[PDB]
Design an enzyme around this catalytic site. Structure first.
Site, mmCIF file in Angstrom:
data_model
loop_
_atom_site.group_PDB
_atom_site.id
_atom_site.type_symbol
_atom_site.label_atom_id
_atom_site.label_comp_id
_atom_site.label_asym_id
_atom_site.label_seq_id
_atom_site.Cartn_x
_atom_site.Cartn_y
_atom_site.Cartn_z
ATOM 1 N N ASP A 139 45.009 29.018 -56.574
ATOM 2 C CA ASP A 139 43.849 28.458 -55.796
ATOM 3 C C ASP A 139 42.618 28.130 -56.663
ATOM 4 O O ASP A 139 41.851 29.029 -56.978
ATOM 5 C CB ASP A 139 43.462 29.462 -54.721
ATOM 6 C CG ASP A 139 42.378 28.959 -53.809
ATOM 7 O OD1 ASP A 139 41.969 27.791 -53.932
ATOM 8 O OD2 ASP A 139 41.923 29.757 -52.981
ATOM 9 N N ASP A 167 40.037 21.716 -54.979
ATOM 10 C CA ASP A 167 40.502 22.956 -54.306
ATOM 11 C C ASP A 167 41.994 22.926 -54.012
ATOM 12 O O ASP A 167 42.441 22.280 -53.041
ATOM 13 C CB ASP A 167 39.722 23.106 -52.956
ATOM 14 C CG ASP A 167 40.030 24.411 -52.221
ATOM 15 O OD1 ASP A 167 40.619 25.372 -52.799
ATOM 16 O OD2 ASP A 167 39.610 24.558 -51.057
HETATM 17 C C1 LIG Z 1 38.046 25.749 -48.384
HETATM 18 C C2 LIG Z 1 37.782 27.029 -49.204
HETATM 19 C C3 LIG Z 1 36.374 27.031 -49.825
HETATM 20 C C4 LIG Z 1 36.211 27.156 -51.186
HETATM 21 C C5 LIG Z 1 34.939 27.169 -51.747
HETATM 22 N N1 LIG Z 1 34.885 27.409 -53.146
HETATM 23 C C6 LIG Z 1 33.813 27.726 -53.947
HETATM 24 O O1 LIG Z 1 32.672 27.826 -53.555
HETATM 25 C C7 LIG Z 1 34.097 28.037 -55.360
HETATM 26 C C8 LIG Z 1 33.169 28.734 -56.131
HETATM 27 C C9 LIG Z 1 33.528 29.070 -57.432
HETATM 28 C C10 LIG Z 1 34.872 28.681 -57.854
HETATM 29 C C11 LIG Z 1 35.259 28.984 -59.187
HETATM 30 N N2 LIG Z 1 35.578 29.221 -60.226
HETATM 31 C C12 LIG Z 1 35.739 27.972 -57.016
HETATM 32 N N3 LIG Z 1 35.294 27.675 -55.807
HETATM 33 C C13 LIG Z 1 33.793 27.057 -50.972
HETATM 34 C C14 LIG Z 1 33.925 26.954 -49.584
HETATM 35 C C15 LIG Z 1 35.211 26.913 -49.022
HETATM 36 F F1 LIG Z 1 35.335 26.827 -47.662
HETATM 37 N N4 LIG Z 1 38.877 26.975 -50.201
HETATM 38 C C16 LIG Z 1 39.422 28.052 -50.682
HETATM 39 N N5 LIG Z 1 40.431 27.936 -51.641
HETATM 40 O O2 LIG Z 1 39.059 29.272 -50.313
HETATM 41 C C17 LIG Z 1 38.045 29.573 -49.310
HETATM 42 C C18 LIG Z 1 37.952 28.330 -48.407
HETATM 43 F F2 LIG Z 1 39.168 28.257 -47.718
#
Ligand SMILES: C[C@]1(c2cc(NC(=O)c3ccc(C#N)cn3)ccc2F)N=C(N)OC[C@@H]1F
Ligand code: NA
Ligand code: NA
Length: 379
Positions: free
Chosen positions: A222, A37
């Site tokens: 991101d 991430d």
């Molecule tokens: C920490 C945080 C976060 C990401 C996820 N990310 C995901 O589930 C996820 C799903 C599909 C794809 C693709 N292609 C990337 N990531 C889940 C929980 C989270 F909690 N990270 C980001 N970048 O955005 C929202 C949140 F801040």
């Protein structure tokens, strides 16, 4: 430098669920799959038997675990987790051959965070200490990695979309993962990987918005977000030219808002009625930019889990934002993306693995002459 065979193909995923890397924590090592991430800065792993988790970190089994005696409560827009901070020995089996003592948030409670049916059980936040929780004195993993070893301060991501896979090259760039040349855009500020977009085109037609609108209130790269998110005002204009460009079929309005899927008879998606999208990014030199172009293959995501439909169904995956532009997996899957932290710049090159067709390909092209690029940044 340039060749890291042991790290190629070290990412896996399922559509809709993100890309994860295998990691080990503690002594003896516990293997966990960890979501990669670039939009956050905590290394946080499930540490209790939540039903959705295949595996979780069992601190009691680790002889090198040190408790920091500090909780952390982390709410996001959707979901939250809560956990206990400590440090432990961490390695990446298909990564550099080193072991480092990193901060770990052992997640003890969470809501709408883990995905039911996914194969990962923590997150590796690769962005900067400025957005670490609870504050910027919790050193992120990659900072620890660079402080403690001779690993060069950069990493690179090749995300191959729809099972998905890709490569995270830690400490380097692997030239077999891209074609043509890399083009770099400055990291405007080290917190998220924040960049500046200076122009947007839909099928080569300029949206003609004040460019500060493209970066309101930031634009970031991101890997932990699927969609291309655009600021509301830009999204309204971009959907309007996309609808126009794609006139020769009509879809419910709901489709464009991500509120409904659209389906076609298998193997017949008419890619060609949908336009290409270009983002010009601020370049390395005064008044110089370059552009990245993605296809509908990137922004129309296939949706498999359609247990009420027989056919080929897609989600429109560009969406309105209140947090600024987010160049999520929709942008990244077209490219090989180099997070060159040592020079504060992000490189893009056409990915050797991106999904394309006989008529059109993703593209990274420059230089272009663009004036007043510093006005595009929001303050
Ligand atoms: C920490 C945080 C976060 C990401 C996820 N990310 C995901 O589930 C996820 C799903 C599909 C794809 C693709 N292609 C990337 N990531 C889940 C929980 C989270 F909690 N990270 C980001 N970048 O955005 C929202 C949140 F801040
Ligand atoms: Na070092
Ligand atoms: Na190459």
């Amino acid at each position: 430098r340039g060749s890291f065979v042991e790290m190629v193909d070290n990412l896996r995923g399922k559509s809709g669920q993100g890309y994860y890397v295998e990691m080990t924590v503690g002594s003896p090592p516990q293997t966990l799959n960890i979501l990669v991430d670039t939009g956050s800065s905590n290394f946080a792993v499930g540490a209790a038997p939540h039903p959705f988790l295949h595996r979780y970190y069992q601190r009691q089994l680790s002889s090198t675990y040190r408790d920091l005696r500090k909780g952390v409560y982390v709410p996001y827009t959707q979901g939250k987790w809560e956990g206990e901070l400590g440090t432990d020995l961490v390695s990446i089996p298909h990564g550099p051959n080193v072991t480092v003592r990193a901060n770990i948030a052992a997640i003890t409670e969470s809501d709408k965070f883990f995905i039911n049916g996914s194969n990962w059980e923590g997150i590796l936040g690769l962005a900067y200490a400025e957005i670490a929780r609870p504050d910027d004195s919790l050193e992120p993993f990659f900072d620890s990695l660079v402080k403690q070893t001779h690993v060069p301060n950069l990493f690179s991501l090749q995300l191959c979309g729809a099972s998905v896979g890709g490569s995270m090259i830690i400490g380097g760039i692997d030239h077999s993962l891209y074609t043509g040349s890399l083009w770099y855009t400055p990291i405007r500020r080290e917190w998220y990987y924040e960049v500046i977009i200076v122009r947007v085109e839909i099928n080569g037609q300029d949206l003609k918005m004040d460019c500060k609108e493209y970066n309101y209130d930031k634009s970031i790269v991101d890997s932990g977000t699927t969609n291309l998110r655009l600021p509301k005002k830009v999204f309204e204009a971009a959907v309007a030219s996309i609808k126009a460009a794609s006139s020769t079929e009509k879809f419910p309005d709901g489709f464009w808002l991500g509120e409904q899927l659209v389906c076609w008879q298998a193997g017949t998606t008419p890619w060609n009625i949908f336009p290409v999208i270009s983002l010009y990014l601020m370049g390395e030199v005064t008044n110089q930019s370059f552009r990245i172009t993605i296809l509908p293959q990137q922004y129309l995501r296939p949706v498999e889990d359609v247990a009420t439909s027989q056919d080929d169904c897609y989600k429109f995956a560009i969406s309105q934002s209140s947090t600024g532009t987010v160049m999520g997996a929709v942008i990244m899957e077209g490219f090989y993306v180099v997070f060159d932290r040592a020079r504060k710049r992000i490189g893009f090159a056409v990915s050797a693995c991106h999904v394309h067709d006989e008529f059109r390909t993703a593209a990274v092209e420059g230089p272009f002459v663009t004036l007043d690029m510093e006005d595009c940044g929001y303050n």
